Design a protein around this ligand. Structure first.
Ligand code: HEM
Length: 405
């Protein structure tokens, strides 16, 4: 389904890439997206899929566009346009200076001090989850750890019932990896229907949870409104349920295939932090964009007001001009360059929480289950979207080789 080429788009700048169903998906989602970085592809292209939009294929441009909010606005960050228009999460749908105020409050509920406070709990859940799987000798990583671990920690932070996970997770997934079952506006509607009552109650009888903190916060000297609280909370929800979840599978899929990398971390644990960054670079998984606020010429290409442009955060670290041998995982890289957590005034607020959950998982898993692999006959399938993911990850191991700690 290709849309007719706009009058201002040069025919030679056309490359029909479908961010929701890339061609070589079978080889891995990152590999599938990296085709945009082949010699035959210009730095800035236009695809006719999903309504027609631009795509910046180089780290340099991606960074530039993200730094220039004057021309590239957050107002419409999702593709297709229908989704981006219905998109109203705070603070991502807003540009600075406005953005700053809300960013500050959000940082209060998921910032560093909060992570430091939840450390022991994160460590406890990881250990408990793993120890319970260790003797089984097998599991579907995606549903047995990748999902429960980060999500339960979030529900704990938000003070929400673990019984709502299935419902909430489904709605989130429809927003990043659309099933066609429902439009973005509907998924968004459903999620807000869930939050409104809760925020209401949290305004009258406040608690210590992130939701209470947000629902009763102060922005620009005055108090936050219900709508504003609802829109910010909706964003924390999507971030807490559909980000770390997927990243952990990509990483575990790789560690399961690379004994030498597992070994390296087991012997030189001081390398884990560095390893975490390299994996964040190699298995980057986010791709959203911006909207042109006016006609603007970007690197020789003429962009028209209203044009939407995808700035794949995942491509920056795969660009050979930024990292030599991009597809190779090297824990000892002198300089690990990436924009996995974004770039510009919208740099990820939950990156500290994320890194903590990743580093804990790596350390605690390899301690108890140092040797594991992917189940025979299983074919690991990836899925593309605003946030890419793994369908399932069947792992197997000899319990006799595990270590109860
Ligand atoms: C590996 C995990 C994660 C990745 C790769 C990631 C990636 C990103 C990216 C690329 C952005 C920038 C989007 C843009 O500029 O349009 C972002 C924003 C954000 N992330 Fe994360 N994120 C992760 C985990 C989290 C978690 C766990 C939370 C917390 C619940 C979270 C909350 C946010 C928020 C609130 C923003 C919006 C900040 C703003 O608009 O100013 N993220 N994230």
């Amino acid at each position: 389904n290709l849309a007719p080429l706009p009058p201002h788009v040069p025919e030679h700048l056309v490359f029909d890439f479908d961010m929701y169903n890339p061609s070589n998906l079978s080889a891995g989602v990152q590999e599938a997206w990296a085709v945009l970085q082949e010699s035959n592809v210009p730095d800035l292209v236009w695809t006719r899929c999903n309504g027609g939009h631009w795509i910046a294929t180089r780290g340099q441009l991606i960074r530039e566009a993200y730094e220039d909010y004057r021309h590239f606005s957050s107002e419409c960050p999702f593709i297709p346009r229908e989704a981006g228009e219905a998109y109203d999460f705070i603070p991502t749908s807003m540009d600075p200076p406005e953005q700053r105020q809300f960013k500050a409050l959000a940082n209060q509920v998921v910032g560093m001090p909060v992570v430091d406070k939840l450390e022991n709990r994160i460590q406890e859940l990881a250990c408990s989850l793993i120890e319970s799987l260790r003797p089984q000798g097998q599991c579907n990583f995606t549903e047995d750890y990748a999902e429960p671990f980060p999500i339960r920690i979030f529900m704990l932070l938000a003070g929400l019932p673990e019984e709502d996970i299935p419902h909430l997770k489904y709605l989130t997934d429809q927003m990043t990896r659309p099933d066609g079952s429902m439009t973005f506006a509907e998924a968004k509607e459903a999620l807000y229907d869930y939050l409104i009552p809760i925020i209401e109650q949290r305004r009258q009888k406040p608690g210590t949870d992130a939701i209470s903190i947000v629902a009763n916060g102060q922005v620009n000297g005055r108090p936050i409104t219900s709508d504003e609280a609802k829109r910010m909370c909706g964003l924390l929800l999507v971030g807490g349920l559909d980000t770390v979840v997927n990243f952990l599978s990509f990483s575990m899929e790789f560690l399961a295939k690379s004994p030498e990398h597992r070994q390296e971390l087991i012997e030189r644990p001081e390398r884990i932090p560095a390893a975490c960054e390299e994996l964040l670079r190699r298995f980057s998984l986010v791709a959203d964009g911006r909207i042109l606020t006016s006609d603007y010429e970007f690197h020789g290409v003429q962009l028209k007001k209203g044009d939407q442009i995808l700035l794949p955060q995942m491509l920056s670290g795969l660009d050979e001009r930024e990292n030599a041998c991009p597809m190779h995982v090297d824990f000892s890289r002198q300089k690990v360059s990436h924009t996995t957590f974004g770039h510009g005034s919208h740099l990820c607020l939950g990156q500290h929480l994320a890194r903590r959950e990743i580093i804990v998982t790596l350390k605690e898993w390899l301690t108890r289950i140092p040797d594991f692999s992917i189940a025979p006959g299983a074919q690991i399938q990836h899925k593309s979207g605003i946030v890419s993911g793994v369908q399932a990850l069947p792992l197997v191991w000899d319990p006799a080789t595990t270590k109860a700690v």
